[PDB]
């Protein structure tokens with residue numbers, strides 16, 4: 001009973017956070033096995049940030065220019081390389097708390113937990129989504145760079161995000177753990193703007209299913225819709241197109257509630273056209289788009305992590 | 307920048323969570339030193355839960371009846387006692403990952419993080435407030451009992467909540483770690499209901515401060531109200547009275563933004579009387595009351611925990 005925006009438990013990632021310092025710049029690093037990963041802009045001064053030639057900057061650095069601290073213990077750096085926009089520091093010590101893990105690149109509309117860190121120390125955890133414009137709506141202050149986003153499957157941590165920068169209107173941009181940016185952003189202190197954002201329709205529908213599961217039913221109507229007619233209405237309110245794959249993906253939730261996906265779509269269509277009339281769904285006065293169908297199943301079925 | 311509902315890092319609690327099985331009932335326990343703490347209704351069947359005579363049922367229990375599992379490892383139970391609604395199982399092994407901890411009773415209006423567990427394994431983490439009617443709006447399925455609520459200050463875990471119950475309306479009740487219920491609820495199957503709730507005025511003001519810190523300022527106005535005039539209005543909308551102590555507690559946020567509390571209160575008065583008129587504050591179309599002044603200061607100044 002109840003439905004909450006729920007993060008993964010963070011303990012397996014907490015054990016991997018370290019502090020990386022290069023001269024006067026400090027930020028967070030991820031220590032897995034004998035590698036520490038962090039944003040490459042740890043090597044820049046404020047001078048360099050406007051237009052850094054990173055390759056050039058790194059050449060002038062040495063192993064001993066990188067100070068890596070795990071709690072009380074300094075780790076000796078014995079090597080360094082750059083992959084895309086991340087720096088990999090080989091250290092002499094493998095992390096005894098390294099979990100089973102992999103690195104993944106997620107798609108827009110997918111969700112993940114962020115462990116916000118300052119000076120190598122966990123501060124807080126929260127769930128967000130990769131927006132269709134390839135930003136995230138995070139909560140990040142100066143010092144948070146190198147904080148990571150992740151999913152847990154059973155006992156395997158999938159790392160999908162590392163934090164690099166803030167963009168206009170207080171949204172955030174970063175990379176996968178191979179150092180490729182999500183979206184068309186660069187790690188440069190420069191004028192950059194995200195595209196116009198849209199609502200993740202398939203996630204809105206999953207959350208309507210969560211509502212029904214949790215006993216909010218008032219928005220169910222008597223109608224059905226075609227996919228074509230649903231999209232005509234959705235386009236008009238800046239919703240992402242719903243595809244047949246999305247319809248198929250919502251099938252398990254549809255079977256659990258006995259409400260056909262295109263019946264739920266007719267309900268959503270009406271909500272978009274007429275509004276909510278000051279009425280709430282799962283205690284929300286707007287439609288929520290940061291739960292995937294899998295997130296809903298997980299929470300409503302009680303999936304747990306080893 | 308940005309502002310999210312943020313839980314504490316859950317790792318220190320995760321290392322304390324175990325599974326407690328008695329006959330047909332499995333739920334979660336908290337393993338600290340050589341004691342496992344769990345809800346005493348673990349000892350009941352179904353006909354027991356009418357009005358269970360806990361003291362009598364416990365006498366008939368053997369230590370051997372309590373199957374405590376910590377990951378792959380059976381903990382041997384060597385004693386058992388009851389304190390109010392909590393069972394203390396003495397086991398032959400002290401938990402090596404026992405953090406620094408305290409047991410505290412929180413006040414209504416204050417927040418904490420919930421680590422929702424099933425079968426002694428973490429499922430997720432989220433932030434809650436102890437409501438003025440002594441319920442929490444959580445997300446708990448069958449198997450969740452024994453999940454705890456906590457705060458962390460530096461390296462110290464303050465355990466404030468252990469989960470026992472769902473009520474009608476999909477809200478939740480439980481005890482402190484000395485086993486005393488928050489509110490007038492009892493641990494048996496008997497029809498039980500939350501009293502009427504109220505909005506935590508001081509928390510709504512803190513969140514309006516959070517919004518200003520983040521540059522969301524459209525609702526600010528040049529007007530001022532007296533405290534009495536504010537309370538005349540807010541009380542009509544089922545908000546808690548704002549006291550001078552609340553005004554003092556908001557001092558830091560007031561000083562940080564330069565906006566006097568009684569200035570800010572005129573915004574709140576106007577938002578109550580006229581609604582938001584299609585706009586949002588920190589992405590919400592409703593007034594949020596589950597951030598304390600401290601939560602705002604912590605998240606907006608990046609304070610850290612290890």
Ligand SMILES: *[C@](O)(C(N)=O)[C@H](C[C@@H]1CCNC1=O)NC(=O)[C@H](CC1CC1)n1cccc(NC(=O)OC(C)(C)C)c1=O
Pocket residue numbers: 026027041049140141142143144145146164165166167168169170172186187188189190307
């Ligand atoms: C990390 O480098 C860090 N040390 O934590 C920084 C985190 C951000 C600070 C404020 N919020 C954050 O998430 N990242 C930066 O400071 C980046 C560096 C990046 C380019 C390599 N950075 C530098 C300069 C400016 C900005 N952003 C900025 O000015 O944003 C607006 C919205 C004002 C245009 C930035 O992100």
Ligand SMILES: *[C@](O)(C(N)=O)[C@H](C[C@@H]1CCNC1=O)NC(=O)[C@H](CC1CC1)n1cccc(NC(=O)OC(C)(C)C)c1=O
Pocket residue numbers: 001332333347446447448449450451452470471472473474475476478492493494495496
């Ligand atoms: C735990 O005991 C557990 N095993 O996990 C139960 C957790 C709840 C089940 C679903 N969500 C929960 O939070 N708690 C109970 O089942 C309690 C037992 C407690 C009192 C000793 N319990 C027992 C009977 C009834 C109810 N509530 C109930 O039926 O509520 C509705 C809303 C259906 C009227 C209850 O919580």
Ligand SMILES: [Cl-]
Pocket residue numbers: 284285286589590591592
């Ligand atoms: Cl809302």
